[PDB]
Amino acid sequence: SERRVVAHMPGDIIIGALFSVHHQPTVDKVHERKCGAVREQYGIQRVEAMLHTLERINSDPTLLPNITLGCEIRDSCWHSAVALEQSIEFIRDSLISSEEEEGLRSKKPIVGVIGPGSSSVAIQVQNLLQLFNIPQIAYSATSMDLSDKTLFKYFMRVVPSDAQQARAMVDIVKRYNWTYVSAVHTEGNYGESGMEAFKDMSAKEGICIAHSYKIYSNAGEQSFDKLLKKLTSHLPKARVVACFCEGMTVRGLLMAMRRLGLAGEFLLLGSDGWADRYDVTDGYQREAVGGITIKLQSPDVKWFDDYYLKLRPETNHRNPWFQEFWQHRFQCRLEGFPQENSKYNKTCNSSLTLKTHHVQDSKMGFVINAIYSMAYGLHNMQMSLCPGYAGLCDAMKPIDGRKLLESLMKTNFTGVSGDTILFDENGDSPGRYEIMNFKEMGKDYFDYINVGSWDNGELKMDDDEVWSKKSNIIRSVCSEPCEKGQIKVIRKGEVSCCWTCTPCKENEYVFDEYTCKACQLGSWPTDDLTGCDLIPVQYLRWGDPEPIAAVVFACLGLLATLFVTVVFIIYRDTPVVKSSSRELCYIILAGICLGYLCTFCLIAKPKQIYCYLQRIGIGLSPAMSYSALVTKTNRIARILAGSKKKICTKKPRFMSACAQLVIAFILICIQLGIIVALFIMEPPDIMHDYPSIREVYLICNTTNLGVVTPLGYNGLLILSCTFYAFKTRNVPANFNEAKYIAFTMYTTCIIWLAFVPIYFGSNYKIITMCFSVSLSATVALGCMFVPKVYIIL
């Protein structure tokens, strides 16, 4: 059977109020609805502000002449049920006015309330108020689910929504490299709507959130320390906590940070719940150092400064809580005053004042703005309905609330800072913000200090003001930015900011931040691994320097060719050359010189005609290098198997030695036709090679049979000339010429046997080729021409 105490002032027009005089009830007291101790700066300060505001309005000849504005002030205690009781205490008269009226005067009905100062309690109170057309103007109901004028017709506030506070906090954590934050929000749909807007606008900016937490502002420590035990499990990953919580929740967090030895552990960001509130930091201030928060911007009120310090408990005769205020903030009893509170000892001196440790409230200009908004709304009702009379005429008897709403939605006036106070079609007056930081000004002297403002995204701050240092607290980033142009990013699937780092291979390039594409055949990734560059071929025109020795060796072969032809072609004093056919040695020198010419026609870029020249040097130059030898080699066969040595009953020759040379001319074009058929069946064209990924070459289109085909006919010709010159090694013909010829063929056949595995097993086989050509061409002249010419010198 508990009853509260109204703080009423009489008048002709009553304006209600809900001010948080006492603290909200703790657990095991909420069913009793016993409010706690008083609140100095959201409570009785607001009450004296409203009373002095109605003093100023009742003295103004401009605003509502011949009109007295009474008021009632009831406690709210931040709780839904308590302020709902007081709302019933408002509309009790409006209920009995429809039951005493029809047969079967107390007070005037309340025309409009002001407050309360939370979100959820205001949402509770409007549901009673919109049933009796009583409009509500708030001063701290900032939650974004109050713009629904379809649902909430009779609600107004002179402060902007928190839907842009989430935007400003997102911009703050965007500006300071934050990525992986934690966030707690108080239960009740202030923190619910604010945290909903925050985690809706975080993913647009890609800011991952560790874990959202909800907790009541009435949580005992046994149910509160679990919150820091859950916040500890993100260390040192999450260093920042984006709080939307109200002031007692943040003070509970600081109390638990002291009660777990976690002082100075990590920063936390807050909304306006602990903007200028020193009381949430007092006693716990070492655990809140470096803490940044925001504030709905408001200036100071000079009127209340000079009015409020001149208030004495022996003078104030219209405020029921001022005695208990005087008791609680000074911790003393009073001897003769009616409100004793004798639990306090150390009775106060009569020399005390209020200005000692005076902290002016942050939001109390908004309260005066709301009261002025009610005043100008009733003034506009007078100007719109009762134009020619000073005072309440019979057009406002009684006052309709709908006409008052139509007046109130269209109010324009100047604020206490001269600001144009107006709002949208949602009852939300726009304003600006300020950002502070709680840090060590002096030693054992901690203070809030302004940093910067915010308006419509224009976030202006001072980074050197915070930390006094450009090396700040640890950025709440889960996985370090390991991107180096070479290390890809792989997320585990849980949170898009806790990824794993992995380097990509040398065949791989960073096509995307989450995958590495491989390049094409032989194309190589660039230095930042973005595009597939190329690697040039080994064209080898000027020759590798160890094959340059083979090139100079072929030059020496050409010099030996010159040294032979200087005494074989021009100086023809030799009787043996003119006695036999000169075309024998002519074809020998021709095949040898074409072999040494096709040696130098190999170290080139393989173009079309250059592959044609190398295919000529590979197929026809071994063909004509043996067509050199075979004419003079088998000229002796027509004497050996023909006349006397090997007796046969046929003469497979003609009756002329020139015609015998014509017969020897037959075997030349037989290989040439087959090589021409290979040219038809395969054109000499360029081909690329890629043995490794890095190794790039340019070759001709070479088949395995393409060199065996000029060799497959020439191999049987070795045994043919061996059978045609077998017994000739013991026939002493022409200074033992057939002996040196058999020795020459014996020397010659070995490297033609050896060429096949040394070319197929090697990885280049191209210097082996010219090496084999010059080895085949050297001994055939070294064992034949030098003893033939030098012995007849």
């Epitope: 105490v5 029921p320 001897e335 003769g336 005053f337 009616p338 004793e340």
Partner: nanobody
Framework: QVQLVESGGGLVQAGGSLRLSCAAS????????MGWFRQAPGKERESVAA????????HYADSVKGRFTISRDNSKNTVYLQMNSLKPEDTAVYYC????????????????WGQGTQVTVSS
Amino acid sequence: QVQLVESGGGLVQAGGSLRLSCAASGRTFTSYAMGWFRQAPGKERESVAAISSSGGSTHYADSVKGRFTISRDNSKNTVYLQMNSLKPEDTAVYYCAAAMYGSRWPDWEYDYWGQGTQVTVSS
């Protein structure tokens, strides 16, 4: 709006005892201090005794220190005054008055009173 009802008055012998009662018709009685008055026939209405809103801090005039004993009840919303050492100059018209918004006692502010009562102490 609380109204007060005094009761318990009448004749009493010298040096006896008597217990006046002050019922309070209404709510919020815990939010008021209480005060007492008496007025002799012909004299003025003097202040007698007082009790605070939370109890504890009781008050007595210097003429009645130790002799009169004040008491309150917040369950039934009623204060009392057990009296002792009753003398014929205590013959007066007693009064019970509620209070709030005061200063140092005796300077309080009394918003309500009661119907009063009559006690005569004979010899």
